[PDB]
Amino acid sequence: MQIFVKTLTGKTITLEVEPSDTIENVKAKIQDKEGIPPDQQRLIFAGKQLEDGRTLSDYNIQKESTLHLVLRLRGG
Amino acid sequence: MQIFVKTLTGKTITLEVEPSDTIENVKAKIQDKEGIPPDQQRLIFAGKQLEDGRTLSDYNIQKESTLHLVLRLRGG
Amino acid sequence: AGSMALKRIHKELNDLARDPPAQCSAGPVGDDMFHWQATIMGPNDSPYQGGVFFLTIHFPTDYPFKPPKVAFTTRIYHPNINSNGSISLDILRSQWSPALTISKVLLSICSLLCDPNPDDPLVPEIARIYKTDREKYNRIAREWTQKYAM
């Protein structure tokens, strides 16, 4: 299924995912198309920061759901 | 039990409370029906500014007692 | 009755889920549709950049005819937000209308982060620094964002 991921660069990417995908899986995929290290990534849905071991389906993230991607501040 | 709360808008509201309610509890209830932040609220009874941790019963506030509600000055 | 409020909150929730703002996110804390949590993202070009600020939201039983109660639970250095997380925004008090929505409220708070109101301040001591030494203000706000918001 497809989901959207919005950034603070306002920008929107799409991801193909399964309900059973974990949040670390989703971060892996974001690293793939954007090159952002998972450890820099904060994923947020419906007002909650998403936990790495949970699945999309634990948060009721469904097809066409939208997540927010926020990058931690990291030095060089 | 019922108590009255008079304002400097002359106006009078009623509250359902228990003798064991704390003053912060009473401020919570005033926020509920008037939308006034507890931190803006000064409650006064029998010439004393009421302390947040005390109960109504510590001040001998009984059924049909009347408290005064005074709002602090606060900027936007 | 209050069934009426619930109907409206479900509606706002559905609208949010369909197309949420980029700079904020909100939804029920748990199984009580009247109790929500929100994230406000620190704006770009602000000393809050990179921060995620958590808020608590409680809808009253006669929503949308009274405003929601909204407070920061994350500490933030701002002239219009105090140590109780209480927020100085007219739409949360005298200026609320049943026309407004929770998304409008969170967007107003994002906007407030970008553009403080130091001449009508909640916290005078911070406004003073904002107005006389904006660079120190940006320092302190940045420091709090790092301590509390990540």
Place this chain on the structure above:
Amino acid sequence: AGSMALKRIHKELNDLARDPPAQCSAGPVGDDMFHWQATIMGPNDSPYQGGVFFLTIHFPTDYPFKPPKVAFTTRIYHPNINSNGSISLDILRSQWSPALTISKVLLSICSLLCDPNPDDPLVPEIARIYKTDREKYNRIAREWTQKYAM
């Protein structure tokens, strides 16, 4: 397509095999040309001297137009390398160009081992020690090299 990436990776592999750098070595982990392992040798005159540090490298399907993903798998005490083996090097992010090669990447990491960037650190706590007590830093870095890198 991705046949294009493969062609480029084969080329880089051939170049490496012809004349590899003295301080590093790399090649496919197994039968998947997109998945490589590397060794970085601890530099002379550094607290890493004598260490062999293993890295993982994954080339993306549209290489060389995105950078490779590269992380340390050996633990290393360094202000610009974190506990996930993640590496703070601009060429791995915003500064990648299809001009660069894997050998250039590993040589940059060798160079980073010689010359940390403690004023723009990945791991602030290590940078602090680097900057205030270089001798303790050299102690701890040496100790980790002995625990983990031989």
